Amino acid sequence: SVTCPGGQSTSNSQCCVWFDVLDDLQTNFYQGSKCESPVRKILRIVFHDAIGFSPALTAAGQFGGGGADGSIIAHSNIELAFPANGGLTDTIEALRAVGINHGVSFGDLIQFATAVGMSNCPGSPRLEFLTGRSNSSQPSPPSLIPGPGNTVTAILDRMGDAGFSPDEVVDLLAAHSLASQEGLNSAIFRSPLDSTPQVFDTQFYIETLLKGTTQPGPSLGFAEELSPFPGEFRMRSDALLARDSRTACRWQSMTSSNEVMGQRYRAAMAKMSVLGFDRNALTDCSDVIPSAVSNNAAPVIPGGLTVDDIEVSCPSEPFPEIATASGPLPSLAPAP
Ligand code: HEM
Ligand SMILES: *[C@@H]1O[C@H](CO)[C@@H](O[C@@H]2O[C@H](CO)[C@@H](O)[C@H](O)[C@H]2NC(C)=O)[C@H](O)[C@H]1NC(C)=O
Ligand SMILES: [Ca+2]
Ligand SMILES: [Ca+2]
Numbered sequence: 001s002v003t004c005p006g007g008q009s010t011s012n013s014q015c016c017v018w019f020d021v022l023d024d025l026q027t028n029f030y031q032g033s034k035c036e037s038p039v040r041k042i043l044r045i046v047f048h049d050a051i052g053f054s055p056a057l058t059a060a061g062q063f064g065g066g067g068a069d070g071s072i073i074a075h076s077n078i079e080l081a082f083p084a085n086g087g088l089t090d091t092i093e094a095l096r097a098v099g100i101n102h103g104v105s106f107g108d109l110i111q112f113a114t115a116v117g118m119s120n121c122p123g124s125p126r127l128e129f130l131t132g133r134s135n136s137s138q139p140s141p142p143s144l145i146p147g148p149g150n151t152v153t154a155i156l157d158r159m160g161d162a163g164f165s166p167d168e169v170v171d172l173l174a175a176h177s178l179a180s181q182e183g184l185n186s187a188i189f190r191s192p193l194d195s196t197p198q199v200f201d202t203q204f205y206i207e208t209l210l211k212g213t214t215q216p217g218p219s220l221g222f223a224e225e226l227s228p229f230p231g232e233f234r235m236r237s238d239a240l241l242a243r244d245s246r247t248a249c250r251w252q253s254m255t256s257s258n259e260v261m262g263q264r265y266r267a268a269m270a271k272m273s274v275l276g277f278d279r280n281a282l283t284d285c286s287d288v289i290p291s292a293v294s295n296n297a298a299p300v301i302p303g304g305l306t307v308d309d310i311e312v313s314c315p316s317e318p319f320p321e322i323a324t325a326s327g328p329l330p331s332l333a334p335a336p
């Protein structure tokens with residue numbers, strides 16, 4: 001039954017070219033299968049590509065955007081001028097070349113590169129991968145990307161129009177577990193959003209709940225808040241969603257289990273991958289995606305801080321009993 005040229009076995013002949021682009025991305029784009037800046041950048045690109053989809057604009061007789069159509073690469077000239085798309089240019093060019101060389105659509109390539117990039121980061125789930133999205137796209141309308149200075153109401157409305165419930169917004173933010181910022185405060189380039197920028201874990205949800213104590217750089221950048229320790233950056237939207245009554249209980253439930261967070265994240269990502277498409281018209285090639293190494297560390301409140309330093313914001317469920325660490329407060333090095 002279906003064998004691909006290099007001897008691997010797959011479900012459909014349409015999956016076979018993806019074994020070649022897998023080898024190309026691991027060796028080159030990811031510099032030997034690493035979980036560093038290329039993965040983090042690609043996670044911003046899959047979001048910004050897919051969120052340019054608005055049912056409300058369509059209802060008002062306007063082009064609403066094509067969703068995960070690869071338009072961020074095909075119309076990079078228009079989309080990378082948007083304020084939330086800076087710092088992406090070099091990754092988008094690298095991706096353009098791989099797509100053109102392999103003859104795969106840009107929309108599919110961005111979904112594939114997200115699943116494969118995440119597989120290089122310890123603790124990640126194996127994300128679903130479907131192929132068949134048309135290469136044809138039109139530029140996304142402006143103003144459909146959530147920004148770090150927006151209120152929780154604005155983020156929930158924009159995300160809700162695209163199709164996400166408040167819970168799914170929180171689930172989607174597990175990608176900030178492999179994250180840093182470059183452009184909000186360039187004095188502290190690549191300052192991490194959690195203490196493990198290379199491990200897909202629960203620490204991001206825990207650490208954003210901790211009382212902001214520290215200013216990590218010479219001044220505060222755009223939409224920057226006080227964070228819990230030296231080297232960590234905290235953006236305002238993340239601080240607010242952690243504490244807002246609409247999202248706070250789901251945020252709190254993401255703090256004690258890497259398995260729960262992983263499942264919820266994979267589900268939310270599978271929904272985002274087909275915005276603008278019919279998943280029943282795509283071919284499933286998830287078996288091409290390899291496993292990530294497992295994360296064996298327990299969720300912890302870092303460097304001596306206790307449950308008394310968490311700003312518990314879910315009034316109905318008590319805070320999970322998480323482990324504490326007998327250490328001094330951490331200073332975080334830049335994300336690699
Ligand atoms: C819904 C609200 C969201 C907002 C307001 C937001 C905002 C931001 C901002 C301001 C940055 C820093 C960019 C820079 O200066 O370098 C960032 C980084 C990042 N975000 Fe989000 N984000 C959101 C959702 C997401 C989602 C859904 C994903 C993907 C599934 C994502 C993945 C990341 C990653 C991985 C980075 C790190 C990039 C790097 O280290 O270079 N974000 N986000
Ligand atoms: C998907 O469509 C894009 C946009 O038309 C195609 O990209 C162009 O590809 C040619 C080579 O065939 C390059 O010289 C151009 O520079 C590309 N343009 C852009 C904006 O990237 C791409 O080839 C199409 N891919 C497939 C598989 O059809
Ligand atoms: Ca798009
Ligand atoms: Ca992490």
Ligand SMILES: [K+]
Nearest residue numbers: 259260263264
């Ligand atoms: K679960």
